[PDB]
Design a protein around this motif. Structure first.
Motif, PDB file in Angstrom:
ATOM      1  N   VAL A   1       1.023  13.501  -6.185  1.00 10.80           N
ATOM      2  CA  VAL A   1       2.012  12.565  -5.679  1.00 10.80           C
ATOM      3  C   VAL A   1       2.606  11.739  -6.804  1.00 10.80           C
ATOM      4  CG1 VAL A   1       0.996  12.380  -3.413  1.00 10.80           C
ATOM      5  CG2 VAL A   1       0.270  10.873  -5.178  1.00 10.80           C
ATOM      6  N   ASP A   2       3.791  11.213  -6.536  1.00  8.43           N
ATOM      7  CA  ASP A   2       4.355  10.150  -7.340  1.00  8.43           C
ATOM      8  C   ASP A   2       3.564   8.880  -7.070  1.00  8.43           C
ATOM      9  OD1 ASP A   2       6.003   8.552  -8.886  1.00  8.43           O
ATOM     10  OD2 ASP A   2       7.833   9.002  -7.787  1.00  8.43           O
ATOM     11  N   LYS A   3       3.623   7.923  -7.991  1.00 13.35           N
ATOM     12  CA  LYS A   3       2.950   6.664  -7.723  1.00 13.35           C
ATOM     13  C   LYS A   3       3.712   5.810  -6.728  1.00 13.35           C
ATOM     14  CE  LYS A   3       4.965   3.833 -11.348  1.00 13.35           C
ATOM     15  NZ  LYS A   3       5.695   2.991 -10.366  1.00 13.35           N
ATOM     16  N   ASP A   4       4.987   6.103  -6.485  1.00  8.83           N
ATOM     17  CA  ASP A   4       5.749   5.397  -5.467  1.00  8.83           C
ATOM     18  C   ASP A   4       5.478   5.918  -4.073  1.00  8.83           C
ATOM     19  OD1 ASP A   4       7.031   3.498  -7.031  1.00  8.83           O
ATOM     20  OD2 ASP A   4       8.634   4.886  -7.588  1.00  8.83           O
ATOM     21  N   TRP A   5       4.569   6.876  -3.938  1.00 15.04           N
ATOM     22  CA  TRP A   5       4.254   7.432  -2.638  1.00 15.04           C
ATOM     23  C   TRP A   5       3.512   6.425  -1.790  1.00 15.04           C
ATOM     24  CZ3 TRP A   5      -0.353   9.798  -0.505  1.00 15.04           C
ATOM     25  CH2 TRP A   5      -0.086  10.627   0.570  1.00 15.04           C
ATOM     26  N   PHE A   6       2.650   5.641  -2.411  1.00 13.10           N
ATOM     27  CA  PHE A   6       1.874   4.654  -1.691  1.00 13.10           C
ATOM     28  C   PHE A   6       2.700   3.402  -1.493  1.00 13.10           C
ATOM     29  CE2 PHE A   6      -1.348   7.334  -3.499  1.00 13.10           C
ATOM     30  CZ  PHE A   6      -2.216   7.473  -2.450  1.00 13.10           C
ATOM     31  N   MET A   7       2.765   2.942  -0.260  1.00 10.18           N
ATOM     32  CA  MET A   7       3.410   1.687   0.086  1.00 10.18           C
ATOM     33  C   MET A   7       2.389   0.693   0.620  1.00 10.18           C
ATOM     34  SD  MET A   7       6.609   1.912  -0.721  1.00 10.18           S
ATOM     35  CE  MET A   7       7.399   0.617   0.224  1.00 10.18           C
ATOM     36  N   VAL A   8       1.240   0.600  -0.038  1.00 12.81           N
ATOM     37  CA  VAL A   8       0.189  -0.307   0.398  1.00 12.81           C
ATOM     38  C   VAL A   8       0.515  -1.711  -0.080  1.00 12.81           C
ATOM     39  CG1 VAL A   8      -2.224  -0.872   0.239  1.00 12.81           C
ATOM     40  CG2 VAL A   8      -1.508   1.494   0.426  1.00 12.81           C
TER      41      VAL A   8
ATOM     42  N   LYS B   1       0.535  -2.258  -4.333  1.00 12.06           N
ATOM     43  CA  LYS B   1       1.839  -2.615  -4.857  1.00 12.06           C
ATOM     44  C   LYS B   1       2.247  -4.060  -4.644  1.00 12.06           C
ATOM     45  CE  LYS B   1       2.644   1.485  -6.434  1.00 12.06           C
ATOM     46  NZ  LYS B   1       2.719   1.718  -7.900  1.00 12.06           N
ATOM     47  N   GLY B   2       1.509  -4.846  -3.872  1.00 11.22           N
ATOM     48  CA  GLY B   2       1.838  -6.252  -3.816  1.00 11.22           C
ATOM     49  C   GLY B   2       1.321  -7.019  -2.624  1.00 11.22           C
ATOM     50  N   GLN B   3       2.150  -7.913  -2.092  1.00  9.33           N
ATOM     51  CA  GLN B   3       1.758  -8.805  -1.011  1.00  9.33           C
ATOM     52  C   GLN B   3       3.004  -9.245  -0.261  1.00  9.33           C
ATOM     53  OE1 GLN B   3      -0.327 -12.265  -2.364  1.00  9.33           O
ATOM     54  NE2 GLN B   3      -0.747 -13.026  -0.295  1.00  9.33           N
ATOM     55  N   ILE B   4       2.897  -9.387   1.056  1.00  2.00           N
ATOM     56  CA  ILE B   4       3.987  -9.945   1.850  1.00  2.00           C
ATOM     57  C   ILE B   4       3.485 -11.135   2.651  1.00  2.00           C
ATOM     58  CG2 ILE B   4       5.573  -9.566   3.739  1.00  2.00           C
ATOM     59  CD1 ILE B   4       5.839  -6.733   2.896  1.00  2.00           C
ATOM     60  N   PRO B   5       3.983 -12.325   2.409  1.00  2.21           N
ATOM     61  CA  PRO B   5       3.618 -13.453   3.264  1.00  2.21           C
ATOM     62  C   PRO B   5       4.271 -13.377   4.629  1.00  2.21           C
ATOM     63  CG  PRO B   5       4.373 -14.157   1.096  1.00  2.21           C
ATOM     64  CD  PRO B   5       4.807 -12.750   1.277  1.00  2.21           C
TER      65      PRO B   5
ATOM     66  N   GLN C   1      -3.228  -5.772   6.070  1.00  2.00           N
ATOM     67  CA  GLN C   1      -2.536  -4.944   5.093  1.00  2.00           C
ATOM     68  C   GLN C   1      -1.465  -4.103   5.760  1.00  2.00           C
ATOM     69  OE1 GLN C   1      -5.593  -2.725   3.256  1.00  2.00           O
ATOM     70  NE2 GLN C   1      -5.831  -4.143   1.552  1.00  2.00           N
ATOM     71  N   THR C   2      -0.520  -3.650   4.961  1.00  2.00           N
ATOM     72  CA  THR C   2       0.481  -2.684   5.390  1.00  2.00           C
ATOM     73  C   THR C   2       0.210  -1.394   4.637  1.00  2.00           C
ATOM     74  OG1 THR C   2       2.099  -4.422   5.800  1.00  2.00           O
ATOM     75  CG2 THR C   2       2.900  -2.192   5.598  1.00  2.00           C
ATOM     76  N   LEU C   3      -0.484  -0.477   5.273  1.00  2.00           N
ATOM     77  CA  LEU C   3      -0.962   0.738   4.634  1.00  2.00           C
ATOM     78  C   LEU C   3      -0.052   1.874   5.047  1.00  2.00           C
ATOM     79  CD1 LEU C   3      -4.452   0.534   5.778  1.00  2.00           C
ATOM     80  CD2 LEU C   3      -3.971   0.192   3.429  1.00  2.00           C
ATOM     81  N   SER C   4       0.858   2.284   4.180  1.00  2.00           N
ATOM     82  CA  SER C   4       1.807   3.298   4.600  1.00  2.00           C
ATOM     83  C   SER C   4       2.196   4.153   3.410  1.00  2.00           C
ATOM     84  CB  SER C   4       3.025   2.660   5.250  1.00  2.00           C
ATOM     85  OG  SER C   4       3.706   1.860   4.311  1.00  2.00           O
ATOM     86  N   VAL C   5       3.079   5.106   3.679  1.00  2.00           N
ATOM     87  CA  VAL C   5       3.427   6.192   2.776  1.00  2.00           C
ATOM     88  C   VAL C   5       4.937   6.269   2.689  1.00  2.00           C
ATOM     89  CG1 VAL C   5       3.436   8.604   2.518  1.00  2.00           C
ATOM     90  CG2 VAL C   5       1.378   7.563   3.183  1.00  2.00           C
ATOM     91  N   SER C   6       5.477   6.197   1.480  1.00  2.00           N
ATOM     92  CA  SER C   6       6.891   6.477   1.291  1.00  2.00           C
ATOM     93  C   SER C   6       7.149   7.972   1.354  1.00  2.00           C
ATOM     94  CB  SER C   6       7.373   5.943  -0.047  1.00  2.00           C
ATOM     95  OG  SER C   6       8.735   6.264  -0.230  1.00  2.00           O
ATOM     96  N   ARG C   7       8.267   8.356   1.957  1.00  2.00           N
ATOM     97  CA  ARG C   7       8.668   9.752   1.955  1.00  2.00           C
ATOM     98  C   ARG C   7       9.748  10.028   0.929  1.00  2.00           C
ATOM     99  NH1 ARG C   7       9.791  11.318   8.216  1.00  2.00           N
ATOM    100  NH2 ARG C   7       7.947  10.426   9.203  1.00  2.00           N
TER     101      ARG C   7
END
Lengths: 445, 50, 49
Positions: free
Chosen positions: A292-299, A85-89, A325-331
């Motif tokens: 899952v929804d596609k918003d489930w992944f918060m990678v 889903k993107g990038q965080i500096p 990386q920030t590999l996580s899951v939206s609830r």
């Protein structure tokens, strides 16, 4: 360098095809009997691992040459990169906010005289993601010693290019395993909404009973009014049919493929109704077909950095390719795991906004949301573990703290399942801090 | 008048279990009893009630 | 019967469905489907299931 070696080196050799078999029976191995050079083809025709300097058959002083070099190249791609889903500096934490609906009141003009400026708080749940992995892929290429191993420049470059593609493949192999790990984390933490099914491999009725729960849940996830269930935070949320992603493995496809579709005059009616993707995993037990929804992944991403150094004393480069990386899951997105086998009666007990922050002498109602798997049971048992002497929860979720209440509280919503002699509990929890009242306090009449 | 068995065609793994469902088609609602049975097969292949 | 209880109960529900939806849209109408019991008539494009 190397001295002598056998030809079979890592060979376990279930049966000796050469002498013990093809020379032995008059059986189905008669097609290989008239071959004159079969004992050589059966010997080194698997490839050898250690190269000898074999001499030449006529001029014994000569040697035999390598006639061809076959550099073989692979390109490894993450099948789940479409969920990234993107990038965080800058920063580490993600503040994902959900606002939820509120409750209607009745019109009354006489009461409205005195309650113009009354206030009603919104219903806002938030959750939090933070950076998870920090890794790098070390690689070292010593270019000048590798010139001894090749004859062409066109092979030398295609080999040094290949080692650069040994990372960037491994960065895609390990990223895939981390995105599978977020699924099995989310099932082990007990947060999917489990639809109990049978194992679809066993009976074709159990396969066809699974397609019915698949299409129902997909239709249920995308009802325009939304639904409170199907996620772990328990809000009213509405999925889009193009945003559902059914993640099955390769075996469960071929069950649907051979049995269900092959014998379907109308293919779209037993279709999986999602953007079906295929894995070979899920690693746990009975877990399959995560919808899952596609918003489930918060990678998200933090660093893609190739940093090189050159040792000048020994002629090599080091290739440190850092991946953070920030590999996580939206609830807040809603997620269903069709788990076969035996699943518990209650998977989780979701409670109210777990940050209540109640003033001394105030009240707060705590709403339990039992994720039952089968049909019905399971009255909720409430509890005020934490501070006491005044703090008392009712049979519904009203807290009613104290004037003397100071410490934070742990409001528990307990559901007893299973055996009365070893009571397995599914205990959902909620936290509440207690701020002082400072008016109508001290002593009292 | 007739009885309809659920999963009229079944294809069960060895060791597997398929739940079957009888649907008694009737006129008078007396909720008639079903006896389940199975033809062919071993001694181990045996149907239970329901 | 509950249509989710079997496949044989499912098709029985459909036969009671389509027979009923034809009765609502006969050209002569009926008294049997209101609650004011008037001879009304439905059309197929109006029935919502």
């Amino acid at each position: 360098t190397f001295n002598d070696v056998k030809t079979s080196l890592g060979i376990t050799e279930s049966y000796d095809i050469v002498n013990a078999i093809r020379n032995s029976q008059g059986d189905n191995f008669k097609s290989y009997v008239p071959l004159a050079t079969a004992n050589n083809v059966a010997e080194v025709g698997a490839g050898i691992l250690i190269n000898q300097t074999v001499q030449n058959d006529f001029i014994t002083s000569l040697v035999d040459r390598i006639g061809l070099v076959v550099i073989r190249q692979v390109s490894l791609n993450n099948p789940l990169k479409k969920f990234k889903k993107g990038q965080i500096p800058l920063g580490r934490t993600i503040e994902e906010i959900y606002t939820d609906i509120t409750k209607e009141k009745q019109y009354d003009a006489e009461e409205a005289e005195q309650k113009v400026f009354e206030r009603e708080m919104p219903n806002v749940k938030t959750l939090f993601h933070e950076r998870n992995r920090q890794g790098f892929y070390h690689q070292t290429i010593q270019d000048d010693s590798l010139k001894t191993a090749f004859v062409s420049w066109g092979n030398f470059e295609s080999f040094v290019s290949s080692i650069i593609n040994a990372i960037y493949n491994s960065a895609e192999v390990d990223e895939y395993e981390y995105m599978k790990l977020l699924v099995d984390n989310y099932y082990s933490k007990g947060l999917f909404t489990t639809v109990k099914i049978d194992e679809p491999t066993s009976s074709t009725g159990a396969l066809t009973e699974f397609v019915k729960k698949m299409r129902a849940t997909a239709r249920k996830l995308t009802l325009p009014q939304g639904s409170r269930d199907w996620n772990s935070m328990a809000v009213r949320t509405r999925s889009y049919m193009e945003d559902l992603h059914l993640i099955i493995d390769a075996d469960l496809e071929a069950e649907l493929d051979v049995d269900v579709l092959a014998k379907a005059f109308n293919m779209n009616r037993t279709d999986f109704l999602g953007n079906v993707t295929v894995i070979d995993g899920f690693a746990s037990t009975g877990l399959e077909a995560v919808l899952v929804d596609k918003d489930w992944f918060m990678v998200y991403d933090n660093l893609h950095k190739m940093e090189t150094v050159r040792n000048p004393r020994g002629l090599y480069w080091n290739y440190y390719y850092h991946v953070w990386q920030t590999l996580s899951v939206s609830r807040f997105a809603n997620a269903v795991a069709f788990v076969s086998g035996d699943v518990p009666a209650v998977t989780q007990v979701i409670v109210s906004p777990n940050i209540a922050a109640v003033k001394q002498g105030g009240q707060q109602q705590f709403t339990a949301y039992v994720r039952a798997t089968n049909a019905k049971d399971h009255k909720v048992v409430w509890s005020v573990e934490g501070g006491s002497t005044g703090t008392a929860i009712t049979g519904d979720g009203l807290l009613s703290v104290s004037g003397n209440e100071d410490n934070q509280l742990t409001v528990k919503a307990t559901v007893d399942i299973g055996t009365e002699d070893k009571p397995k509990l599914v205990v959902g929890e909620a936290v509440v801090s207690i701020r002082p009242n400072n008016a109508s306090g001290g002593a009292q009449a």
